[PDB]
From a paper:
Efflux transporters of the RND family confer resistance to multiple antibiotics in Gram-negative bacteria. Characterisation of resistant E. coli mutants and structural biology analyses indicate that the compounds bind to a unique site on the transmembrane domain of the AcrB L protomer, lined by key catalytic residues involved in proton relay. Thus, our work unveils a class of allosteric efflux-pump inhibitors that likely act by preventing the functional catalytic cycle of the RND pump.
In contrast, replacement with a hydrophobic methyl group (5, EC90 = 62 µM) did not impact compound potency, suggesting that hydrophobicity is an important criterion for activity. Computational data confirmed the tendency of one or more inhibitor molecules to persistently reside in a channel linking the cytoplasm and the BDM88832 (8) binding site, as inferred from the crystal structure in the L protomer of AcrB. A lower density of compounds was seen for both the T and O protomers. BDM88832 (8) interacted mostly with residues V411, L944, E947, and F948 as it travelled from the cytoplasm towards the binding pocket. A persistent interaction between the inhibitor and F948 could rationalize the observed hypersensitive F948A phenotype in comparison to wild-type AcrB.
Residue numbers in the entry:
A (entry chain D): 12 to 166
B (entry chain B): 1 to 1034
C (entry chain A): 98 to 241
D (entry chain A): 290 to 337
E (entry chain C): 50 to 97
F (entry chain C): 866 to 913
């Protein structure tokens, strides 16, 4: 669609006023680029909290997965967007969502050492014993990275 | 000196002949090019990393070279960009007047020492250091019409056969192949490699062993066993020469004894070094040669010689191969020279008619006919002596000089003819007196005109180089005209003219000339009566002058400004930008529509369309492309409807309908070398290691704030590309070491297959060419294909890539910019309608100061030039204005009288601005030089009136008004004769619709309109100025 | 004598010797300079807040100041009174022997795992017919 | 420690250095300050 | 080293000579390639 | 050698014209120079 491509650009750039106008005209919130990223994927990636809430109000798929199985929660958790992670989880984001690699939001959060987000994910029932394709847990990542603070949280 | 040559006419002829031979000689040896060196010296370092992303290229090549670019003299700034095609280009721009050879060798030398710091793959490919500031003479296109050859097949032929021959051609200074010669392409198959337990590592290792030059030695070499009779060189293994030999390359021998060859696990063919660019000429496969003119070479002789060489190659071309000329700059140079000769021929013809209309004797009409060509040839000699060339700017400089060269010829002859008609002296005695009245004034005029134009040449940068072409040409032409006026024309006048009886004004004749002489004598009495009445009431005319001065200032401010006028060049471009991640095939479909439009709807305008898929000026990639539209001759495109600007608008509006593509046409700049030169060039710098993502957010902020000021700033966009989705693959080190797979074999198998790998060289028909190994298209397209690639472990087991790897999507830069070593982002923009570029920069600086901490800025290119040029202008105007006064002050022997002359400046400027504003032109160089020349002759007219008026008061003791009325009477005829001839002389330039009309229009309009007012006003205002000034001061 | 031509001639001959020099000497970067023996000036950099150490100040001058000064016309040579930061791997011989490893194994591992790999593109040229995707493949990057 | 390039003007080069140092100062971290403990050019300017 | 006249002409001499284009005041260019693998490309220029 | 012989006629021509114009300027005549320049072949034959 026309507005679908404009919303993808708007959501990424973080133009809240343009997104508002697009939601009124009826821009496709389930619009996806070649890699399978929705406006919510982009908003979550670039850390645009206001647009994440606006998109979710307009029936945006919270558990949308790209062509490699990654969801908006994976991106929000990986790039340390605490506010967006909470909003996504409140609106029913799969906390134990596995990509094609078997990586979870907890794995990604633990890898970059986002202590706040890790505790938010565990609060909403993140599987701490969840293993990726190599059999690595969020704890196995913490001890390898040498994050003593993160290591204590996962016990 | 005039007296010296009046008595020695043969001496005067000798000097005139010496000048002619010097000029004739200069014309033969003089270089000939469209434009001279305008842009400051620029050296571009180009490197290539096959299969590398923008960040890999930046962090291993660009940064390493940038840090080593020290100890280099006269560097202004350094700029670079690293893109996802595996390319980096570092441009080092130098101070104007810097030796480009010394600049390049100093840059080259620092690169050489930095080569051991670069990756092995980059050292293999090598790093080119070229003078990029130079421009193309023409672009020779090579196509195949019978579809027997691909662009790779055509490219190889041009390289192997044509390139060196054209490079050797007389006057050729550089030849760039638009494509690459053949390369031995090994298209690997992962299914077959895995079947025989082999990898790209084995394929590369085997090629390096079985395609190599091996050193052996000699039979009976020194030191020998005495008694040895024969000494022969030993030839061992040499390079492979054919696809067949590469096919027979052994990889493995099985248990049963069967042999695994390279042709079993790969497709082997001759192809291009890269497949990024697809070149089409009217839909047919195309290559070409970008030919640059050598230093001091003749453009017209060079192009003729290039066509001559290609004509001799024609009988040896394969069937279907054809030569085409989509870009050629020689038609401009040939027309620029032709229209100069035409103008100066018509100028001499026009003088003859006006000279005979007033003087009515052929003996007087031949003095300007001799004097004008002598001074013109003289200019060519001075032009050559100062190292200048015959170019558009120097050629239009001589067209703008004719008005001042013609004036000197008329003023001298007319004054002699008047003195004879009034006093009744013989030609010899008449000339002695006639020259005595003007000899001191002409020397004074010469010094004043010098003070107007000479300072204009002392501008710095690009604008100073352009002005210097006009300045030196006009000052040279002006200077020689005065020497010829004080040597030749006095001698000619004294010998060639016929005596006139005292009080013989030709009123005693019959027919037309008898009637004309009566009319003009009656009109002179009418004019002198008008001045008499004007001088009774000077008060109201001083008020009328201030209205002209205020009216002048008003128009000068409101007249839109632009360095050079947009010309119909017979060529323009159509940019094609597709969305992020768009493929080569998708971009081709859009280019085919662009090509289809131009050959359908513009069949009567467009000659050919050169469709280049993969290349853009603002960045490269599969999602970009440009179509170079080549038009028919200007004589086969009548009216404004069939011009570049009209077609540009039609094309832009037509391609607006196209979806998922930003497609629009636009004309080339007047000078391709210089660039856009309309707006500003802003650099946004990371001064505190903020990083790419943070510099993007600061850029978006500056752009957002620029959008909130449409009244000041317009079209403020980034020059570079935006971030795109990129396939991040994480190799698990633990899993690799566990299965016994080395990281080298993993990173080689990935890099070689998906990216390509330059292994070594082979010799194809006595020509050394590259050998590339790479995956066959269908096995390196999608992320599912990653798992089809296997790497052998230490235990000999074949492990798939999926076993020890994990992938995700992230965003990254496909083109990373750096300015002066630091990370940057180039931002373009221009001042809003009515607003100046200087004001727009002031706001951009203010907006930039409110950006986050560690985010800096700088002005580059045209912006850097404008600011340092704007600082010089005030000081140069001041110097120019002070010397004009000092010269006139010495001439008249008065601090006050000079003002009477300097007050005529606005009389010529108002007419030029009225003409330009009416016709809808801009305040350009050609116009600005047109004003300086208009001011020159308007001042010259006034200088003689004031001198004559003053001399009558000093010598003959006449009154202020008596002398002024007597002066304007004597000055009326020669002023009208000069103006009539010169206005008719620049008539063709104004009405010109065809080739190089944008230049001729800017030249003609400002001059003609200015001359009309400078003529009509001055004859009534000069007498007022002198009288009002004389009354005030003593 | 023209110092520009003097430099060109000296380097022309140095380039014949460059390949014969040890690989460690080349990778440190050989420099040819046309400058005076004495110092024109010394540009000192201090911290009045005592927020940065002698080692912190030296790195900042090297990383953010030195290059721009080195590129300035008239500046023949620039000497950093200090050193730019490097990733220092201070080896322990007791712990290396403990796991039967040597400096050779450490250097092999760093070159392997601190690497900037050129991994090509998805849907790269020459592509197949009907390709819609074009993305850069990003493998190992330099450690930060 | 800055050494003058062969033939180059001492005062003009010194001015060019101060111009480049002035472009850096704004983006310094807190506390960092340029000092001038050794310069041969002030003598040349003042002496003349 | 160890390359015949034909091999070194194709891989060195012709590769260098084809890039010796657009040099100012070049009168003529003479070169020889021998069995010791030695290449000497002499470029003679105009007087002055 | 080829270059020396090719430019020799041009050199003699320009040399004669310069000497002629020089005389014409000094003697204020076209005829007197012509009377002098006619003596050139009387010398040239002797050299030959
Ligand atoms: C035929 C006789 C006429 C001869 C004409 C001689 C031409 C004049 C030679 C000097 C040309 C260069 O002109 C030179 O420009 C520089 C700027 O770069 C000026 O330098 C300027 O510096 C700053 C720039 O912001 C100004 O504020 C200041 O007013 C001015 O001095 C010089 O004052 C001027 O002399
Ligand atoms: C703006 C349009 C372009 C026009 C440019 C202006 C200059 C050309 C205009 C025509 C000039 C001739 O116009 C001239 O005006 C003056 C006005 O003082 C007249 O002079 C008038 O006043 C004086 C006294 O003050 C009387 O002695 C005189 O008898 C009377 O006619 C002249 O007789 C007339 O010839
Ligand atoms: C490419 C070369 C071109 C330039 C070569 C030089 C051109 C010379 C042309 C000059 C001859 C043209 C004029 C005719 C001369 C001529 O015919 O000579 C006789 C005349 O009467 C003039 O001489 P005269 O009055 O007797 O001398 C004074 C004695 N007191």
């Amino acid at each position: 669609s026309d507005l679908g491509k404009k919303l993808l650009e708007a959501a990424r750039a973080g133009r809240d006023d343009e997104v508002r106008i697009l939601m009124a005209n009826g821009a496709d919130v389930n619009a996806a680029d070649v890699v399978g990223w929705t406006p919510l994927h982009l908003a979550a990636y670039w850390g645009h909290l206001e647009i994440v809430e606006v998109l979710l109000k307009n029936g945006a798929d919270v558990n949308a997965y790209d062509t490699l199985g990654s969801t908006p929660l994976h991106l929000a958790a990986h790039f340390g967007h605490l506010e967006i992670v909470e909003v996504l989880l409140k609106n029913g984001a799969d906390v134990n969502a596995k990509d094609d690699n078997g990586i979870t939001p907890l794995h990604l959060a633990a890898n970059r050492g986002h202590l706040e987000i890790v505790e938010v994910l565990l609060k909403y029932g993140a599987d701490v014993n969840a293993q990726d394709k190599f059999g690595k847990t969020a704890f196995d990542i913490s001890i390898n990275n040498g994050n003593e603070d993160l290591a204590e949280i996962l016990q | 000196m005039p007296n010296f040559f009046i008595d020695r006419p043969i001496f005067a002829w000798v000097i005139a002949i010496i000048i002619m031979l010097a000029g004739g000689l200069a014309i033969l040896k003089l270089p000939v090019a469209q434009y001279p060196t305008i842009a400051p010296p620029a050296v571009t370092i180009s490197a290539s990393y096959p299969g590398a992303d923008a960040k890999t290229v930046q962090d291993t090549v660009t940064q390493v070279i940038e840090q080593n670019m020290n100890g280099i003299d006269n560097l202004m700034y350094m700029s670079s960009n690293s893109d996802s095609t595996g390319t980096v280009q570092i441009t080092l721009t130098f101070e104007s007047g810097t030796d480009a050879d010394i600049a390049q060798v100093q840059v080259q030398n620092k690169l050489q020492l930095a080569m051991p710091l670069l990756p092995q793959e980059v050292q293999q490919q090598g790093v080119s250091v070229e003078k990029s500031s130079s421009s193309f003479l023409m672009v020779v296109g090579v196509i195949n019409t019978d579809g027997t050859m691909t662009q790779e097949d055509i490219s190889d032929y041009v390289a192997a056969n044509m390139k060196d021959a054209i490079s050797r051609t007389s006057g050729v200074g550089d030849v760039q192949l638009f494509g690459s010669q053949y390369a031995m392409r090994i298209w690997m198959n992962p299914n077959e490699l895995n079947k025989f337990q082999l990898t790209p590592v084995d394929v590369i290792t085997a090629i390096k062993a079985q395609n190599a030059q091996v050193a052996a030695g000699q039979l009976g070499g020194t030191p020998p066993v005495k008694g040895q009779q024969l000494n022969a060189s030993i030839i061992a293994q040499t390079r492979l020469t054919s696809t067949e030999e590469f096919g027979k390359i052994l990889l493995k021998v099985n248990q049963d004894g069967s042999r695994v060859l390279l042709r079993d696990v790969a497709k082997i063919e001759l192809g291009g070094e890269n497949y990024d660019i697809i070149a089409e000429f009217n839909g047919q496969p195309a290559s070409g040669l970008g030919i640059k003119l050598a230093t001091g070479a003749n453009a017209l002789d060079t192009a003729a010689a290039i066509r001559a060489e290609l004509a001799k190659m024609e009988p040896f071309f394969p069937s279907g191969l054809k030569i085409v000329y989509p870009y050629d700059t020689t038609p401009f140079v040939k027309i620029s020279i032709h229209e100069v000769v035409k103008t100066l021929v018509e100028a001499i013809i026009l003088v003859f008619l006006v000279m005979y209309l007033f003087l009515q004797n052929f003996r007087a009409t031949l003095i300007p006919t001799i004097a004008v060509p002598v001074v013109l040839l003289g200019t060519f000699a001075v032009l050559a002596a100062f190292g200048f060339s015959i170019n558009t700017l120097t050629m239009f400089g001589m067209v703008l000089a004719i008005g001042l060269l013609v004036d000197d010829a008329i003023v001298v002859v007319e004054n002699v003819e008047r003195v004879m008609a009034e006093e009744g002296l013989p030609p010899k005695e008449a000339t002695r007196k006639s020259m005595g009245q003007i000899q001191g004034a002409l020397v004074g005029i010469a010094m004043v005109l010098s003070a107007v134009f000479v300072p204009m040449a002392f501008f710095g940068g690009s604008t100073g180089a352009i002005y210097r072409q006009f300045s030196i040409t006009i000052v040279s032409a002006m200077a020689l005209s005065v020497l010829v006026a004080l040597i030749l024309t006095p001698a000619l006048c004294a010998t060639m003219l016929k005596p006139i009886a005292k009080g013989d004004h030709g009123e005693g004749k019959k027919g037309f000339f008898g009637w004309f002489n009566r009319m003009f004598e009656k009109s002179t009495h009418h004019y002198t009566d008008s001045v008499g009445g004007i001088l009774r009431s000077t008060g109201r005319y001083l008020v009328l002058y201030l209205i002209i001065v205020v009216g002048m200032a008003y128009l000068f401010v409101r007249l839109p400004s632009s360095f050079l006028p947009d010309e119909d060049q017979g060529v323009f471009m159509t940019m094609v930008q597709l969305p992020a991640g768009a493929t080569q095939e998708r971009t081709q479909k859009v280019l085919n529509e662009v090509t289809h439009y131009y050959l359908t709807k513009e069949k009567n305008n467009v000659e050919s369309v050169f469709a280049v898929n993969g290349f853009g000026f603002a960045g490269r990639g599969q999602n970009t492309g440009i179509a170079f539209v080549s038009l028919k001759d200007w004589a086969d495109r009548p009216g404004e409807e069939n011009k570049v600007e009209a077609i540009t608008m039609r094309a832009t509006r037509a391609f607006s309908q196209i979806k998922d593509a930003m497609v629009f046409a636009f004309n080339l700049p007047a000078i391709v070398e210089l660039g856009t030169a309309t707006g500003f060039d802003f650099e946004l710098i990371d001064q505190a290691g903020l990083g790419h993502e943070k510099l993007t957010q600061a850029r978006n902020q500056l752009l957002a704030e620029a959008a909130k000021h449409p009244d000041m700033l317009t079209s403020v966009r980034p020059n570079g590309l935006e971030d795109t989705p990129q396939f991040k693959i994480d190799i698990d080190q633990e899993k690799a070491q566990a299965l016994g797979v080395s990281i080298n074999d993993i990173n080689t198998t990935l890099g070689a297959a998906w990216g390509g790998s330059y292994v070594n060289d082979f010799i194809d028909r006595g020509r050394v060419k590259k050998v590339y190994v790479m995956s066959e298209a269908k096995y390196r397209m999608l992320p599912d294909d990653i798992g089809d690639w296997y790497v052998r472990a230490a235990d000999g087991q074949m492990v798939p890539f999926s076993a020890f790897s994990s992938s995700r999507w992230e965003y990254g830069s496909p083109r990373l910019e750096r300015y002066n070593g630091l990370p940057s982002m180039e931002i373009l923009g221009q001042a809003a309608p009515g607003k100046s570029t200087g004001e727009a920069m002031e706001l951009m600086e203010q907006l930039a100061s409110k950006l986050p901490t560690g985010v800096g800025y700088d002005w580059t290119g045209m912006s850097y030039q404008e600011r340092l040029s704007g600082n010089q202008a005030p000081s140069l105007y001041a110097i120019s204005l002070i010397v004009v006064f000092l010269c006139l002050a010495a001439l008249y022997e008065s601090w006050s009288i000079p003002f009477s002359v300097m007050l005529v400046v606005p009389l010529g400027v108002i007419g030029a601005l009225l003409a330009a504003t009416f016709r809808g032109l801009t305040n350009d160089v050609y116009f600005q030089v047109g004003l300086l020349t208009t001011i020159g002759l308007s001042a010259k007219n006034a200088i003689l009136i004031v001198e004559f008026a003053k001399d009558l008061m000093d010598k003959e003791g006449k009154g202020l008004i008596e002398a002024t009325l007597d002066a304007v009477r004597m000055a009326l005829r020669p002023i009208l004769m000069t103006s009539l001839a010169f206005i008719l002389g620049v008539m063709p330039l104004v009405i010109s619709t065809g080739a190089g009309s944008g230049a001729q229009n800017a030249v003609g309009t400002g001059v003609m309109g200015g001359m009309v007012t400078a003529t009509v006003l001055a004859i009534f205002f000069v007498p007022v100025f002198f009288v009002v000034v004389r009354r005030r001061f003593s």
